[PDB]
Amino acid sequence: EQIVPFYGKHQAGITTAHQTYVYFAALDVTAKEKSDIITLFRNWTSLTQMLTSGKKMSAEQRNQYLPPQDTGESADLSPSNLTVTFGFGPSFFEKDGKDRFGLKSKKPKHLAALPAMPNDNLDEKQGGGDICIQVCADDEQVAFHALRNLLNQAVGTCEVRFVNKGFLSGGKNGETPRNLFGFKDGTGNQSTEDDSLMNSIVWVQSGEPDWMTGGTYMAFRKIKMFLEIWDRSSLKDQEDTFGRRKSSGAPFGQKKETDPVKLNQIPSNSHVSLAKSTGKQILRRAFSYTEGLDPKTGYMDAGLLFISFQKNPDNQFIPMLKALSAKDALNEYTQTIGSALYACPGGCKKGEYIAQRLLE
Template sequence: MKKKPLLKDDNKSTGIFDHKLSRREMLRLTGASGLGLLLGGGSVGGILAAGQAAAPPQASGADSLPFYGTHQAGILTPAQNFLCFAAFDLTATKLADVKKLLQAWTTAAAALTSGSLIGSVNDNPNLPPSDTGEADGLTPSKCTLTFGVGPGFFDGRFGLASQRPSTLSDLPAFAGDSLEPQWSGGDLCVQACADDLQVAFHAIRNLARIARGTAVLRWTQEGFQRTGAADPKGATPRNLLGFKDGTGNPDVTDDAEMRKVVWSGSEGPAWMNGGTYMAVRRVRLRIEVWDRSTLSDQESTFGRHRQSGAPIGATDEFAKLNLEAADSAGKPVIPPDSHSALAHGDGTVKILRRSYSYSSGMDLTTGQLDAGLLFISFQKDLVKQFVSIQQRLAKNDRLNEYMVHTGSAVFACFPGVREGGYIGEGLLG
């Protein structure tokens, strides 16, 4: 069931005024309640006009990643240290307003990822600044912004039902799911990643501010992951259970492999050529139960050694899973119901994982930590890849004893943006 938007505000700003505004006028224009105050107020037209020139970048080079390109950044990009993920509900009823939002988001994203302030109204004492300012003086921190649309985008409101990809549907119910509406769904998504959490938060805050009057936040989740000081660029990050997460990922430098696993091609609608499909699952971990388990039980659950990340019986993290190997008693070395064995299957179905750990404080009902994994994967076909793997895991995975899926969403992530174009241009024209 579609979650009711948190706020609907149809007031639009009427442009940029050069006369001094009274307090009453200011409150009327910005909105003196709810999300408007939290995010700084403003609308698509008032905060940032599409094509508006941005301030000069604060930094460049290795700390800044290009926004424009054949594919969106934040997919094959090596995972940054922090994530701010946001799903939005559209409140607009006209496709023209959605197009205007995506154009404004494009202009803002180009500025945010280069370390620039958004817009050009940041020094007028009589107006709200066009950028909220908390990232002023910070470097881009390799910020990437990845945009997508959910199945609800094609529900008939905007006349785009015929353009919905066949693979883009809400995920089926899986065994053991305990999904909560406040962590599920969305018409639009933005994945903001950066090596500085304040930079990622700043991006989501300002995009939500720009969306006011057209879309409202549905849910958000912050995340983190670190690879360790010994090998900060090459090591596989560990999840909150202490095991390496993403060892079995395909090689993102292999273009042929990426076309096979990640990028949509001629099999989908033309507007998705060069895009991909995102699955998002909020997985709460039963940390307190896990912490009472023996190391041997933990390793049998994952099918891997905790310290090295290698398959049980091997020493190299990236050694191939030998699911036929048996001990002297004929017992499989790697349990067939271990997480690695089930996720691997016969090895022919792959996905690209890009997950982050999260911690949302304490559950006041149970007194336990509300912490876990925001699982994110990219694939060219949600049904053939993600759903087929998750059905095996949900049915038999030993890890199910220690986790519960509380949130779920899927999105079609657009192809990359050309300079002069905008996000979703192939779909919206």
């Protein structure tokens, strides 16, 4: 009953209401024939449809001497609005000059590594990758189960580049969820329920190969947040960093979270002023992370798995990166340590597989 359709015009996990939990994986294809990639996406499709659907691998195992077909730890759990979203990095189309799989002619127009930015401190292994898998659910164990079982299918075809995970709880009464800086996160997104707006901001309708119709580009930035530096700062510093008030989420000088931002009443280098002043829009769908103590600092290693969706990242996304990178007050408390851009195919129809129209 917490079931999100897998099949559709679009992949789920993009305009789908934001779940609590994410696992975010990137893989590199080690196989040499597009035929092996085809079988992988076919199997991934059939398994994703089962995992998200609420169907359970039912009463079975006729041969004790074989491994179970499923790892079993989601047996008693609800589907918890599980979505699984697939994308492909530039290196899937071309790696080191070689068109490894004969796909270059079906390359998306805007798929390239993101440009270097000031204050970047990228670990190459924490970004890029041929394929990304974004697994979301309202229950961590459900999302981990889905990733693990998808990844088990890729053995021999791909190597896993990295796996991150994160969380972001919505308010008990539907309030915008707060990031680890304690600020409402997502206010500035247009309504994911507004088809017109999602069409103009997220969804590909033209100018791209047909496998991208109903698809989008997914930007990923792994951004370390220095909680100890932030927590020791004044409220004034924290609000002046954003250009919104912390509790209310209101733009400075406004009453409500949803009041429009008045650019002339917020600091010119506040986060919100810089992002908004590009005049561009993206759909941000981020999750917080914590990964134990950072050994180099001896403080919590925490941050944001930044994930946004936009139909044209050269028009919509890269200008924001540019506008923020030098001037953002948030630069005091953050540092990007991983980066990637992926193209997300349009939705799968019942009886097709993911990226069928790309792989042919």
